[PDB]
Design a protein around this ligand. Structure first.
Ligand SMILES: Nc1ncnc2c1ncn2[C@@H]1O[C@H](COP(=O)(O)OP(=O)(O)OP(O)(O)=S)[C@@H](O)[C@H]1O
Ligand SMILES: [Mg+2]
Lengths: 419, 187, 240
């Protein structure tokens, strides 16, 4: 009986299990404390059980292990990781470990780890020798991320719209810029469930920071892959450590020649949190933001790449535009030009309720030649020629109109050529 | 085989559509009763108006699905009757159609299509003449009961309840609303 | 194509481009032109704070060593790699050998110096420190020709109209100090060849009554000189 099963179950199962075998007044404490107490009481019988989570190392040599369902929160559910484990299994941050856990004896509160049985979804012994991420060789996004879902709704119409306006590649680095109330979050949804439906092989990861709790809870119940989200109620350090540990966990996953995709909303919020938490360097720019603050989220964004010998790391991060606050710009032109692709949106298109609001002319990609073939490259270039003249709102109206009657993007291509 | 499954699909779709109809009627009479009553339940009135809306959308969807199933049943019946009539009198049809139906395999695609449309037109005048002389038409004896249960045309309530057209963005937002209301009613 | 055709030997020069103008492949073409036409000269491709994939592409599509700094690490790495490349260039000068440097980009290096230089109170419009000005001046003037033997030369890359305000100030002071500056975009060509500032200064006095040859000094010659492409015109601003 692993921690994951009772961690995932709702309150009803927890309270029923507590009242069945002798937990008193268990309904009036926080859920992480509830699972801690009930699992400690159950493990008082000395039955070793499996564990799951992601480990991290604090300032001291001792390390902790967290759970994904707990939104990567440090609490009573944390699992001990002794430094001896770090030496004897070359452990580093972000490795997902599965194995027997140790019930707590006198002198300790949390649960320790008896043994390891699965490191990064792999046998611990064969993972002792491994290639570090630092010396990996970046490469272009050769593999096209075919996200055309083909289900039959206007949401699929939006999917086809950014298929015709963007070239999403496996392992690329993408930025999304849009004004508030333009369609960012559920565009990221589109990306998430389209990747889930079209590419089940690759793992889906969605990172949300300082977002409203209702958005978090509707995102958690809509995406197939696991999603990590920390609301605005928590301090800046919460978001900072969430982002660090999630990006380095994705690093560890892609080190195993895996295809990892991270959807970030937003990156401006991450930069603001880092600026808040980082010590001042004494060299402040316009808007109350100093120099070294921007480095951390900016290397964070730069972590995305494609590995020549196996594995890819795609990051699709949103950037806020024209919100009336100067630092939002500061970040906007600080990250501008550092992404493999840019996706722009306009609020005025959303004003007339034409959706999505992607700016066809402004949106673009770097090195389209290597990603696709020559025939489809020219086939999209001729669309660029024919759709460039009229206005972007007129362009989108025209595109959605003559794409509504067409089942797929290809049939759209051969239906345009005859005209 | 296919006709039986299509028939039960159509009948259960009709049952579901009737279920949605009486649910919408009950919600409408409840809302009218609370409007007529002196009780000033603004929140309850808004909730009932949302219920009326979502029930109307569900009735529209049920009517559309029932219409589609009815059309599928009729199409399958027509196809089966034509298949067996053709297996019976293929030589009889071909004796009349020979002037432009022989050498079908060796004819090119455009010639094949032109011959097909010519025969199509000719049989169309044949059908209109047969209907002009005008007997009383009756169902095939093999599958009469299924067709008479289904009927020649669907209910007028089905066709006029599906008169309005909803953009599929509205369809999906109503899907979320209906799921939320079903969850709330279950709770 | 050939560096001797464009940059020659011993003299500095710049190329300035806007975003989305074709910088990377142009630098590639310059690189292999140097490699084939003049294999004797030591190739040196340098990149500052740009995407790692392009760094790998640069260092894999050329033969010379490419010391580059991706855009992940902070600007201290950029500044210190700047001093160490300039010191190794000076050593190669003492080695009696010619070198060619393909740096990208000097606007990046300049505003990295700006955001890293300690505050000295000599800031100007836009918070540009004077130290972050004449340290780049020292680096850019270290590219002088070697008059005793061999010849060092560098090709410069600069970015224009990037939606910011820091870049055009250093661009105009490079204009003040530039030797030769290849241009790609539309407006800045007329901005340089026909200075709008000088035009406004002249128009403030309208047609200034320049006595005698002072009026005739300003001359413009367009010669359709023979070029391998075929009749490429050359326009010269003849002054006295
Ligand atoms: N393809 C679409 N299908 C349905 N509704 C859409 C579509 N595109 C935009 N909308 C509407 O756009 C509105 C705003 O969408 P949001 O995603 O909430 O905006 P936003 O860009 O996320 O900004 P935030 O999250 O409020 S700060 C909603 O009311 C949606 O109904
Ligand atoms: Mg949103």
């Amino acid at each position: 009986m692993n921690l994951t099963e009772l961690k995932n179950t709702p309150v009803s199962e927890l309270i029923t299990l507590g009242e069945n075998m002798g937990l008193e007044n268990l309904a009036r404490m926080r859920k992480q404390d509830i699972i801690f107490a009930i699992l400690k009481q159950h493990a008082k019988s000395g039955e070793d059980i499996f564990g799951d989570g992601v480990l991290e190392i604090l300032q001291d040599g001792f390390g902790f292990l967290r759970s994904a369902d707990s939104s990567y929160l440090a609490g009573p559910d944390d699992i001990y990781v002794s430094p001896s484990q770090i030496r004897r299994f070359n452990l580093r941050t972000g490795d997902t470990i599965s194995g027997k856990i140790r019930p707590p004896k006198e002198g300790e509160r949390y649960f320790a780890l008896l043994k390891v049985n699965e490191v990064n979804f792999d046998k611990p012994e064969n993972a002792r020798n491994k290639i570090l991420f630092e010396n990996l060789t970046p490469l272009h996004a050769n593999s096209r991320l075919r996200m055309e879902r083909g289900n039959g709704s206007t949401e699929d119409l939006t999917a086809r719209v950014l298929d015709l306006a963007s070239l999403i590649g496996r392992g690329q680095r993408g930025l999304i810029v849009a004004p508030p109330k333009a369609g960012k979050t559920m565009l990221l949804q589109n990306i998430a469930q389209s990747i889930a439906y079209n590419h089940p092989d690759c793992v889906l990861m969605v990172l949300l920071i300082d977002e409203r709790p209702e958005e978090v809870t509707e995102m958690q119940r809509l995406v197939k892959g696991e999603v990590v989200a920390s609301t605005f109620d928590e301090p800046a350090s919460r978001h900072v450590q969430v982002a660090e540990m999630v990006i380095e966990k994705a690093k560890r996953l892609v080190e195993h020649k895996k295809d990892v995709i991270i959807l970030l909303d937003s990156i401006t919020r991450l930069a603001r949190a880092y600026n808040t938490v980082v010590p001042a360097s004494g060299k402040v720019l316009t808007g109350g933001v100093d120099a070294n603050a921007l480095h951390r989220p900016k290397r964070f964004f730069g972590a995305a790449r494609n590995v020549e010998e196996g594995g890819s790391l795609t990051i699709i991060a949103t950037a806020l535009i024209d919100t009336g606050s100067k630092m939002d710009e500061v970040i906007y032109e600080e990250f501008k030009g550092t992404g493999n692709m840019e996706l722009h949106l306009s609020r005025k298109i959303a004003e007339k309720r034409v959706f999505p609001a992607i700016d066809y002319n402004r949106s673009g990609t770097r090195k389209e030649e290597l990603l696709t073939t020559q025939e489809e490259l020219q086939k999209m270039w001729i669309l660029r020629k024919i759709i460039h003249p009229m206005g972007e709102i007129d362009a989108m109206e025209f595109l959605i109109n003559k794409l509504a009657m067409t089942k797929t993007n290809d049939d759209f291509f051969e239906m345009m050529k005859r005209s | 085989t296919a006709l039986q499954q299509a028939f039960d699909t159509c009948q259960n779709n009709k049952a579901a559509w009737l279920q949605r109809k009486n649910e919408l009627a009950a919600a409408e009479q409840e809302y009218l009763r609370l409007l007529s009553g002196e009780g000033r339940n603004v929140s309850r009135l808004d909730e009932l108006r949302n219920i009326i809306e979502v029930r109307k959308w569900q009735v529209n969807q049920a009517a559309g699905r029932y219409i589609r199933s009815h059309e599928a049943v009729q199409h399958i019946s027509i196809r089966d009757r034509l298949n067996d009539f053709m297996q019976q009198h293929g030589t009889a049809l071909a004796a009349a159609l020979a002037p432009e139906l022989m050498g079908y395999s060796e004819l090119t695609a455009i010639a094949r299509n032109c011959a097909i449309q010519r025969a199509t037109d000719a049989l169309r005048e044949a059908l209109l003449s047969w209907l002009a002389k005008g007997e009383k038409i009756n169902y095939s004896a093999q599958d009469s009961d299924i067709l008479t249960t289904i009927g020649f045309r669907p209910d007028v309530a089905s066709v006029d309840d599906s008169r309005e057209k909803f953009t599929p963005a509205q369809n999906m937002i109503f899907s979320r609303k209906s799921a939320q209301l079903a969850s709330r009613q279950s709770v």
